[model samples]
Target: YSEEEKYAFVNWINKALENDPDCRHVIPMNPNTDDLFKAVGDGIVLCKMINLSVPDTIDERAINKKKLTPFIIQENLNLALNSASAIGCHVVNIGAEDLRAGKPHLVLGLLWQIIKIGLFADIELSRNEALTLEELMKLSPEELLLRWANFHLENSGWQKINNFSADIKDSKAYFHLLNQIAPKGQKEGEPRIDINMSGFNETDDLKRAESMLQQADKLGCRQFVTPADVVSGNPKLNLAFVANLFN
Candidate 1:
């Protein structure tokens, strides 16, 4: 295990999962520390990284989040390993033991593969090499996510939001946006999963954001952005959170 690679992965994983509430205990992990192996030893970060690169590749049910015993921990490792394998990794001789004990060589190898997958997967634009296409090319993942928000907003005659940062700091826009897309007697057998708006007026920003996200959990779109992640206006996390909802 190169000390350098372990440090690099720690930073990378922290960037992706720092906003995740479940990861609060181990997140903000030291990039210069030697605990990278132990940090990922439980399989939560590994499983989340896999899901981020390729959504729904691993069944979230397979990884237990709490009340862990060694047997359950082993099960999580097994689940993460096979899920990695199912997503095209060659498990040839690598076992849960390698990850369980923080083997750096193997860990770095897998980390590089998973991280590259997302960047390479979407690094393309199909509108052609025209001037307008160039304009489109300049748009960002965050920008496109913002556009998606305004598109929904536009359809509802709700005022368009400007950015995920300050514009959404209060989370009021998310309520209208969520309500706009939520099915309310519109689809077959789709009951009104109408977003309750009680938290829409919560005095505190974090509480408002939490209730909003909690309702989103009802729709299984609770993939990213905790209440604080929402209030803080974290660009990458906010961008990915909206993209997951759009998908």
Candidate 2:
């Protein structure tokens, strides 16, 4: 893409992030290469790229067929763009051969420079009001999970369901449940149901897992295991996980 097109793409993503309350905190004061790099290093950016450097003889269909949906791809791209804008640099060859061939540490160095410059610093809340990261780090694991549940449910327009602590242990499960209950395409007035968690793997703590299962039922979710529950071996678990979620 031309430089002008790249600028437009980054700007478009910036506006989207500005409008998204969950993402607004990361928007840069000035979208520049420095700021963008910091965003990536800070675990705020999600960059997804297709393999543009592959040999021409390789079957393009094979690569494209396994790619994520356009909606998901765009969502990730927008995040990368938001970070890029913050640092005032264009994402070089996002889906091009150069990006695919880029060295890992060198790429990280590009981002590290912005991090060193404090380009992606956090915005502090009112003095002595919000919990500081240091304060939060002191909480017990259980307490931290509980806080996460509260924040997630409240933001999703759900009143805190009684005994709604089950399924909060796994970050993937939490996010999956969030998307299931409050899909982005959901109509404003549509009724939404709590997700079923019957398929999630039980926590290592049996007592906690049982309690979570009971709570899951009360919250209109379930707990079951499927092919996707396999964390290793066959990678088809991801496909199975997606299928179970939608089917």
Tens-digit per-residue lDDT, 22-141, candidate 2: 345556324334344333332223331111111132222322212346554444444544554454444553432222243344444333333222211221211234446788866643
Count backbone overlaps in model 2: 19
| Candidate 1, position 138, lDDT | 78
Runs of candidate 2 exceeding 4 Å displacement = 1-101, 108-148, 152-194, 201-247
Candidate 1, residue 41: how far the Cα is off, in Å: 5.9
Question: Each candidate's lDDT (Cα)?
Answer: 0.73, 0.36
So what's the TM-score on candidate 1?
A: 0.51
* True-vs-predicted CA distance for residue 77, candidate 2, Å: 16
Candidates' TM-scores? 0.51, 0.23
Write one digit per residue (lDDT tens) for candidate 1, span 1-247. 5554565467657877979877787898887776787888888888888898788987777768898788887888888888877777766678888988888788877776676556434533322432255676777655665776898888877688888767887778887788886877767687877778789889999999998888877776664466877898865456545655655
